Design a protein around this nucleic acid. Structure first.
Length: 167
RNA sequence: GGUUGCGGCCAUAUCUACCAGAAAGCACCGUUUCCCGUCCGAUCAACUGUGUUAAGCUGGUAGAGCCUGACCGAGUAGUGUAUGGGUGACCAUACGCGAAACUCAGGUGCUGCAAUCU
């Protein structure tokens, strides 16, 4: 797409470390990011969150990025999310209608921001999980979109400029 | 298998069942007249052996104590560094760091010199 929204960067690496029969074992976090600036950062924050490491103990092997595999079209992304507001972070599973992973980020940001309290310092999320169109449960925007694929309903929905013409 | 002189590391050796340095490489007991302790040979200061392995040193064997690690607790509490949010107080954020228990493990010692042995 044009001027990102957060392509997920599949960052991989190691650790890589010391003269001991240990070594840390092989990891992944695929993190949504804008390129390498973000790439680094997330990895250190993941390494803080779950793992423990260090900066130095986490070694990055490689990077491979993100465009559109499947259709622009029409997941309605199930997102596992955390929002920081008037104390620390509270858990969320938000399943919202989207075009795509580029979009998902913006639509969630706008939702943390507006609705939930969000401001600067945050981060992000935990996972995004695709779903089948009929399955989608919570609920307002999407319920209409699910119905549209159905169709008929696309003949519905067809509404927005509608009051304007004359014909 | 090493007992023991002299040590060092000095909580991996504090404490409480019971097997072993030992027919001429101990401790004990016996002379405790005496140099010697006195208030009593007990303390001690001395001279020695019926023999006895019971204690003693130390070696054999078990738990609370404890160091050291692994395991979660899993980078958590806390923290210098740069800064966003909150009404306040207060919080977070990236940059570097990172204690408490838990359970499991190792060890009821180590190491060196000599009196150097059946």
């Amino acid at each position: 797409m044009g001027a990102f929204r957060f392509h997920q960067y599949q960052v991989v690496g190691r650790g890589l470390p010391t003269p001991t029969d240990e070594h840390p074992k092989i990891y992944r976090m695929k993190l949504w990011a804008t390129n390498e600036v973000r790439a680094k950062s997330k990895f250190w924050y993941f390494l803080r969150k779950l793992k423990k490491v260090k900066k130095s103990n986490g070694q990055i092997l490689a990077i491979n990025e993100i465009f559109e595999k499947n259709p622009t079209t029409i997941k309605n992304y199930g997102i596992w999310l955390r929002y920081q507001s008037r104390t620390g972070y509270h858990n969320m599973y938000k399943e919202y209608r989207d075009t795509t992973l580029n979009g998902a980020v913006e639509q969630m940001y706008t939702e943390m921001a507006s609705r939930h309290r969000v401001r600067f310092p945050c981060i992000q999320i935990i996972k995004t999980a695709t779903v089948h169109f009929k399955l989608c449960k919570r609920d307002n925007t999407k319920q209409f979109h699910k119905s549209d694929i159905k169709f008929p309903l696309v003949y519905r929905k067809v509404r927005p400029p509608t009051r304007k013409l004359k014909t």
